[PDB]
Every structure is written in C-alpha cells, then in structure tokens.
Amino acid sequence: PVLKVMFHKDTNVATVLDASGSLSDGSVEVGTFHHPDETYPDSVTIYHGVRDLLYKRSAKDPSQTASYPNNIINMQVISIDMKATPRLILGTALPRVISTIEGKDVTWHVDVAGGKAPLTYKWQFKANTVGAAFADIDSGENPTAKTATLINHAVTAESAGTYKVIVTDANGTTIESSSLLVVGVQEPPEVASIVAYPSPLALSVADDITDGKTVKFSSLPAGSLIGTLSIKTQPDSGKATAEISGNVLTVKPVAAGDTTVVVTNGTKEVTVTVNVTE
Amino acid sequence: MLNYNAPTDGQKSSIDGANSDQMQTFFWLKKAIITARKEQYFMPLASVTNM
Amino acid sequence: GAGAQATGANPGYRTSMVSGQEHYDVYPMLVVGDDSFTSIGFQTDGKSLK
Amino acid sequence: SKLPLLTENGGRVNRVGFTRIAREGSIHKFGFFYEFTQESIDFDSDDGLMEHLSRELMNGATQITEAVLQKDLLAAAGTVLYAGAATSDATITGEGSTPS
Numbered sequence: 001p002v003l004k005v006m007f008h009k010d011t012n013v014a015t016v017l018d019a020s021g022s023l024s025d026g027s028v029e030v031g032t033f034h035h036p037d038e039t040y041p042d043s044v045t046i047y048h049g050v051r052d053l054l055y056k057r058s059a060k061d062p063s064q065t066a067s068y069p070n071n072i073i074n075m076q077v078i079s080i081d082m083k084a085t086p087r088l089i090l091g092t093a094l095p096r097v098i099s100t101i102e103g104k105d106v107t108w109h110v111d112v113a114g115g116k117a118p119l120t121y122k123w124q125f126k127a128n129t130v131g132a133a134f135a136d137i138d139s140g141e142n143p144t145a146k147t148a149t150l151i152n153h154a155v156t157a158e159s160a161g162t163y164k165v166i167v168t169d170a171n172g173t174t175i176e177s178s179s180l181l182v183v184g185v186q187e188p189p190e191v192a193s194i195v196a197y198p199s200p201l202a203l204s205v206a207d208d209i210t211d212g213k214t215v216k217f218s219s220l221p222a223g224s225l226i227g228t229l230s231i232k233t234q235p236d237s238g239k240a241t242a243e244i245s246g247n248v249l250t251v252k253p254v255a256a257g258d259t260t261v262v263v264t265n266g267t268k269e270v271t272v273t274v275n276v277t278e
Numbered sequence: 279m280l281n282y283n284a285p286t287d288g289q290k291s292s293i294d295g296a297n298s299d300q301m302q303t304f305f306w307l308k309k310a311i312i313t314a315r316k317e318q319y320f321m322p323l324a325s326v327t328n329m
Numbered sequence: 330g331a332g333a334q335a336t337g338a339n340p341g342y343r344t345s346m347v348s349g350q351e352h353y354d355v356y357p358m359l360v361v362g363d364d365s366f367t368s369i370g371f372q373t374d375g376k377s378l379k
Numbered sequence: 380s381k382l383p384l385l386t387e388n389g390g391r392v393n394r395v396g397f398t399r400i401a402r403e404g405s406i407h408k409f410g411f412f413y414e415f416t417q418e419s420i421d422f423d424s425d426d427g428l429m430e431h432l433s434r435e436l437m438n439g440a441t442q443i444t445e446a447v448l449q450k451d452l453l454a455a456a457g458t459v460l461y462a463g464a465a466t467s468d469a470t471i472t473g474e475g476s477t478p479s
Contacts, residue, residue, distance in 0.1 A: 076414075092454035099297035099400065109454045117348040147468040148331070149459060170348065182297040246288060280396065295398040332479070333472035342473030353473050357453055366455070368448060369406050378444055 003035045003046070003084045005053050007062045007072070014050050015081045023083075028063040030054060036087070050080050088167055088175035089114035100155050101184040108150040108163055110177050115169030123150045126162040130218035131197030134164055157185045157223040185223050191268050193220045194229075196249075200273035203240065203253040212241075212252035215272050217263065226265055233262035240274050331355045409443065411436075 002019040006027035015023055019032065033049035055073060058066035072078070092111030100106050112119060123145040124134040139146035148167075152159055160183040166176045195218045203213055219226040226247060235242050235251065239259040242251045249263060253276045261272045283289035285300045294300065330345040332353030343354045370378040383393035413432065420428060463479035465471045471479040 092450060095455075096403065097297060099295075105458065107457065107459050109456065109459075111450065111454055118350070143467040143470060149468055151459065151467075184296050293397060293399045295400055298399045298401040301401075331468050331471070333470055335472075336474065338474045340474060340478070342478070344473075353471060353479075355468060355471050359453060359456070361452060366452065369404055371406060 001035060001085070002032050003049070004032045005030050005050055007054065007057070009062050012078050013081050014054065014078055016046055016050065016084050018084045021084065030057050030062055035084070046080060046082065047075070050078075051075055054078065085171050085173060086115050086169075088112055088119075088169055088173050090175055090177060094163075094165065094177040094179040097180045097182060099182040099184070102156060102186065103154055106152040106155055106159070106181060108165065108179055110148050110165045110167070112148065112165075112167040112175055115173045116171045118170060120168045121146055121148055122166045122168075124164045124166065126164070127158075128161045128218070128222045129220065130195060130216045132161070134162070137163075152181075155181070155183050157183055157189070157221065159183055160222060183223070189221050189224050191219050191224045191226060191265065194218070194226065194263065194265060194268050194270040195220055196263070196270045196272045199270075200275050201251055203251065203274060203276045205253045205256060205276060205278055208253050210252075212250045215249040215251065215261075217247045217249070217270065227267070229263055229265055231261060232264040232269060233260070235259040235261050235274055239276055409440075409447075411439070 004017045004019055004021055006015045006017065006023050007013070007030045008015075008025060008027045010026065013027070014030070015027055017023060031053040033053065035046060035049065037044050054062075054075075055068075055071050056065055057072055058064040058070060059072050060066075060070070062072065090111070091113050092109065094108055094110055098106055098108070108123075110121075122139075123137045123142075125137050126132050126134045137145040137150070142150070142152075144151045148165070150163065150165070160181055162178055162180050164176055164178040166174060168174050196215050197218070198215060201213055201215055217226060217229055229244055229247060229249075231242055231244050231249075236257075236259040237254065239255055239257045240251050240253055240261075242249060242261045244250075244263065249261060249272065251261065251272070251274055256276050256278045258276070259274045261274060263270050263272065280292040282291050285291060285294070286303050290299060330347040330352035332344075332355050335342075335344040335351040335353050339353075343356075344351045345354055346352075368378070373379045385392065413436070415432075425431065461467070461471065461479065463471075464477040465479040473479065
C-alpha cells in the first residue's frame with residue numbers, strides 16, 4: 001500500500017499515515033512511498049522511505065523543496081510517528097518443501113503476528129495436475145484448516161501438491177506462506193489420461209508467429225508416469241506447426257483458422273484444439 | 279543401474295529421490311569476460327595550460 | 330489466547346484476552362530428538378553465533 | 380520371503396538401489412542499538428557504566444537468539460499431539476467434561 005508522510009517542523013515529528021489519511025496539527029505533506037516496496041521488498045523499511053522524502057524538502061520550510069546542504073538530513077533529531085494500518089509479520093514461514101511417504105501424518109506450522117486482532121486462518125491446496133488452481137481445504141472435515149497448524153492424516157499420492165495458509169487481520173490486511181508436499185509413492189499408478197493446459201490454445205498470427213505458444217502435459221492420477229510424449233497427428237500445416245520436447249508442445253501459427261494436434265505417450269492420447277486469429 | 283540421467287532436463291539421477299536433486303549441476307568459471315576501455319583520440323590532442 | 334473461547338465456567342486454567350475476548354492459552358511439551366537440527370551462523374567459529 | 384539368498388552359481392540376483400534426500404535452511408538478520416551523550420558517560424557516577432550496558436546488550440542478544448531457536452524448533456515439530464479431546468488449536472479448552 002502507498003503510505004503518505006507529513007512533517008511538523010517545530011516538534012520535528014514525521015507522521016506516516018495511509019494514502020487517504022490526514023493530520024491537522026501544522027504537519028505539511030512531504031510526499032508518499034510504497035511500504036511493502038515494489039522492487040527490494042525486504043531490503044528497506046518506513047525509516048528509509050521517510051529519510052528519502054525529507055531529503056527533498058527544505059529544513060527552513062518543509063513545504064518547499066531544497067538541495068544539500070539546505071535540506072532535512074539529521075534523522076537522529078526526527079521521530080517517526082506511525083499511524084498507518086499495521087502490516088502482518090510472518091514470525092515463522094512454512095517449510096519450502098515437506099516430504100513424506102504414503103500413509104504418514106503431515107503437519108504444517110505458520111507463526112503470524114502484527115496487524116489488528118483477531119487473526120483468521122484459511123488453508124488452501126493446489127494439485128500438481130497442470131493448470132490447477134488453489135482451493136480452500138474444508139474446515140468442517142478438517143478442523144485444523146481454520147487454525148495456524150494444519151494436519152493431513154494418512155497422506156496419499158493425491159495429497160501431493162502446494163498448500164498455502166492465508167492469514168487476515170481485523171482491518172483486512174493479509175499475509176500468505178506456501179509449501180510443496182512431495183509424497184513418495186512405492187508403486188506408482190499407471191496412466192489413465194493425459195491432460196493438456198492450456199486447451200484450447202489461442203494463437204494470433206500477428207503476435208505469436210515467431211515464438212509460438214506452449215502447451216504443458218500432465219498425467220492423471222497425479223504422480224503417474226506420463227512416459228515419452230510424441231505428436232501422433234500434426235496440425236494442418238496451412239494453419240499451424242507443432243513441435244514437442246519432453247512434456248511441452250510448442251505451436252506456431254501460419255494462418256487464421258482452427259486446427260488440432262494429437263499428442264500420445266503410446267497408450268493414451270490427448271487432443272489440443274488450436275484457434276488461430278489474424 | 280544407477281544413472282546420472284539429465285538433471286537439468288528434468289530427468290533426476292537414480293540416487294536422487296522425489297525430494298532431492300543435484301547440488302552442483304554446472305561449473306562456474308570465475309574468470310569473467312570484460313570489455314576493454316574505449317580508445318581516446320581527442321584527449322591526446324589537447325595541450326594543457328595550468329590553472 | 331490461541332485456545333478455545335473461555336467463559337465463566339473456567340475451572341482455573343490460564344487465559345488471555347484477544348481483542349476483548351478471553352481465550353485459553355496453549356502451552357507446549359517439546360521433545361528434541363538427537364541430531365534432529367543444527368543452527369546456522371554467518372562466519373562463526375563453529376561453537377557459537379558471531 | 381525377501382531374504383537375499385544366494386546359490387553357488389551366483390547370477391544377477393538380489394539387486395538393490397539407494398535414495399537421497401536434500402534439506403535446506405535460511406539465515407535472517409537481527410540487531411539493536413542504543414545512543415548516549417558524552418556527559419552521560421563522563422559525569423555519570425559509575426565509571427563502568429559502558430561495561431554494564433555492553434554486558435546487558437550481549438545478554439539480550441543471546442536471550443533473543445535462544446528464544447528464536449525455541450520458536451523455530453516448536454514450529455518445525457514433525458508430530459503434534461493434542462491433549463484431551465482437542466482436534467485443533469482453536470478447540471484446546473480448559474472447561475467442559477473433557478478439558479485439554
């Protein structure tokens with residue numbers, strides 16, 4: 001969020017308020033800055049944003065701009081008074097990857113403080129299937145998915161995928177930590193289907209002729225061995241060209257109109273619909 | 279047979295499990311490639327008067 | 330205050346306020362197995378943090 | 380049924396494999412400071428005030444490191460057991476017929 005800064009010259013107090021916030025005590029606007037920092041987010045803090053604005057203002061009149069050595073530059077005499085919405089602080093982030101074998105109980109543990117209480121927790125899970133999205137873990141079935149400590153009893157190969165805690169404060173401020181669960185399947189289930197994402201594939205002759213676009217393949221169930229992929233049926237050469245490397249199909253447009261690519265692992269097939277525009 | 283396979287191409291080595299990978303997949307040549315200073319043609323032509 | 334909400338039926342277990350609401354405190358009982366972890370320091374002597 | 384029995388002719392029998400796991404951790408930055416004037420040192424009664432303050436600073440740093448280590452160890456516990464009938468943190472209660 002953008003945080004405004006105001007400076008009282010007589011008391012030497014620099015108040016940090018929200019972008020919409022306001023103060024009526026003699027404090028003059030000295031500029032604004034983004035507090036979670038767009039580039040270099042964990043590299044700087046409010047002190048650095050308040051010091052870079054005050055450097056651009058006159059010590060004799062803080063409403064006017066000045067240059068060194070007639071600017072505000074001794075921060076030892078300046079006191080920052082924070083009155084902006086407080087940020088949530090991850091005290092303990094989630095492990096980047098947890099690993100287990102089928103049948104064991106997994107347990108995630110996030111520490112989160114700061115903001116305004118009460119703090120609420122909502123766990124979510126994204127499957128490893130290509131093109132999947134995160135989705136709330138039912139907290140009626142799993143009472144722990146509404147707390148800071150999640151527990152997944154007796155993992156399966158389907159438990160594998162990204163997990164994510166989203167903590168919200170009473171002001172609506174939010175923080176999130178994520179963790180990939182890897183599950184060791186002793187006897188991997190044999191492929192039932194191949195999934196293509198994106199499918200359909202939308203191409204533009206104007207935009208995509210040089211580099212094309214890519215389609216990724218995944219196996220169902222998750223953790224099955226997809227095997228070696230090959231193109232069984234090429235697209236119409238008057239509409240598109242296609243090449244496959246590993247689990248990635250690259251498709252390049254030739255002219256407007258619809259075509260299809262059939263990809264196989266020798267036992268299963270998937271059709272990618274390709275829509276080419278001008 | 280334990281194979282090295284191609285870790286950088288998505289094929290892990292046999293020794294590496296589902297939650298493991300090669301620590302060193304390349305060698306870093308620490309002698310860098312640098313460009314030389316540009317040539318100056320007009321600075322040599324200048325005679326200097328002391329100030 | 331990480332436990333369940335506490336009411337006047339509290340037999341005498343510890344609680345704390347969470348934004349004007351009383352919740353039971355949660356206390357740990359930790360077992361640290363042998364060789365289960367190590368600490369990391371930057372340019373240390375191997376015995377303690379720098 | 381799975382013992383690696385061997386006959387006198389040998390052969391390509393009882394082949395096995397091995398696996399490997401990787402684990403990682405990161406470091407974080409900490410620090411605090413205090414300020415003083417020359418008069419608060421020279422005119423102060425205790426000629427050893429700076430030694431006192433430095434010792435307290437070191438003690439605070441060590442205590443903070445110990446607390447952070449304990450917090451990390453608690454967060455990293457592989458198994459969590461809930462006393463009583465509790466199933467989650469929000470359910471841990473000291474009242475009712477089955478307190479935690």
